[PDB]
Amino acid sequence: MALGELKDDDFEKISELGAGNGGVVFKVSHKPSGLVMARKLIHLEIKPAIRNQIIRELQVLHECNSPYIVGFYGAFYSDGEISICMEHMDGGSLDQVLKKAGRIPEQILGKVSIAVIKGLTYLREKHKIMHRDVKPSNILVNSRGEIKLCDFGVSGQLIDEMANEVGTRSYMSPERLQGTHYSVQSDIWSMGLSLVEMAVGRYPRPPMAIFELLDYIVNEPPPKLPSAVFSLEFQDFVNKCLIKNPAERADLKQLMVHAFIKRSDAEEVDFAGWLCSTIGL
Ligand SMILES: Nc1ncnc2c1ncn2[C@@H]1O[C@H](COP(=O)(O)OP(=O)(O)CP(=O)(O)O)[C@@H](O)[C@H]1O
Numbered sequence: 001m002a003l004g005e006l007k008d009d010d011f012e013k014i015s016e017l018g019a020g021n022g023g024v025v026f027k028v029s030h031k032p033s034g035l036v037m038a039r040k041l042i043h044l045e046i047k048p049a050i051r052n053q054i055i056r057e058l059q060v061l062h063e064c065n066s067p068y069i070v071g072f073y074g075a076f077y078s079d080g081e082i083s084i085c086m087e088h089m090d091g092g093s094l095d096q097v098l099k100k101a102g103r104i105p106e107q108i109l110g111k112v113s114i115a116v117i118k119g120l121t122y123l124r125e126k127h128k129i130m131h132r133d134v135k136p137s138n139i140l141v142n143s144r145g146e147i148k149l150c151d152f153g154v155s156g157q158l159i160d161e162m163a164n165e166v167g168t169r170s171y172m173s174p175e176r177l178q179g180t181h182y183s184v185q186s187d188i189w190s191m192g193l194s195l196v197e198m199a200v201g202r203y204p205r206p207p208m209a210i211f212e213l214l215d216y217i218v219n220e221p222p223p224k225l226p227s228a229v230f231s232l233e234f235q236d237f238v239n240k241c242l243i244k245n246p247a248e249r250a251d252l253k254q255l256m257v258h259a260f261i262k263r264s265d266a267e268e269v270d271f272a273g274w275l276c277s278t279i280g281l
């Protein structure tokens with residue numbers, strides 16, 4: 001193979017890159033090849049049959065090649081925790097970026113829009129993967145102004161074995177909330193929701209108890225942007241991503257050529273630099 005077989009004797013932790021509900025992420029060295037990677041250890045107790053079925057379902061990641069999807073290196077199981085070795089993005093994810101920034105300005109968000117539309121499009125068309133948890137922490141950035149997606153649901157079983165240990169319940173679309181089977185129209189919703197978040201610099205809904213929220217999302221109408229201070233186009237984009245009825249939501253084709261996308265393509269945004277400025281890179 002490109003990498004052969006991976007065993008965690010070869011890795012030497014370099015720093016901690018962050019962590020969250022389901023584990024921890026280290027920057028690591030792959031001593032025998034030189035490769036710097038990000039290592040993601042997911043603790044799962046499961047019947048071996050079914051962990052090898054996962055460590056193999058993941059090999060599909062090797063045929064994910066796009067400048068908009070984080071790059072894969074392999075996955076091995078070790079003493080309890082399935083490991084996913086992936087490309088290291090020296091700029092953490094937009095969630096860390098939001099913390100430092102406060103808000104992320106519209107123009108930077110149209111570039112992220114492009115990156116997401118396109119990166120979801122790759123996965124949809126080249127591989128029939130729906131993302132499944134599009135949120136700021138799942139969109140990553142590097143000092144080269146690249147913006148890649150990760151933590152999409154490649155492995156049917158990893159998905160299954162994860163639906164018992166609860167999600168970003170908060171980023172789920174209303175239909176998905178009312179029980180519907182995940183559809184792409186849900187990825188879109190969660191994208192929009194993310195953009196609004198990063199635009200406003202906080203979860204865009206009035207603060208309530210978790211259970212109230214879930215019905216709040218099902219019952220009340222969707223977030224919208226403050227309308228004084230964002231282009232009418234942006235407002236439309238987000239809006240179109242956020243129509244509650246999933247049959248009227250805009251889709252990836254219809255989005256790819258929206259006013260706000262086209263305007264953003266044309267635009268010259270030194271995101272790379274903005275970034276190093278913002279988080280001190
Ligand atoms: N390939 C990568 N390169 C650099 N940093 C990464 C990375 N993958 C993950 N990280 C960092 O570690 C953090 C932890 O990510 P992880 O997926 O473990 O939790 P999360 O931040 O997605 C939220 P949750 O745990 O609620 O889903 C990420 O926000 C990111 O900053």
Ligand SMILES: O=C(c1ccc(F)c(F)c1Nc1ccc(I)cc1F)N1CC(O)C1
Pocket residue numbers: 022040061069070071072084086132133138149150151152153154155156158159162
């Ligand atoms: O880690 C996952 C996850 C879930 C299902 C699956 F199939 C995966 F491969 C996952 N991890 C994962 C996917 C692609 C890359 I490039 C790197 C990765 F680490 N999360 C879903 C939550 O949003 C967190």
Ligand SMILES: [Mg+2]
Pocket residue numbers: 137138151
């Ligand atoms: Mg994640």
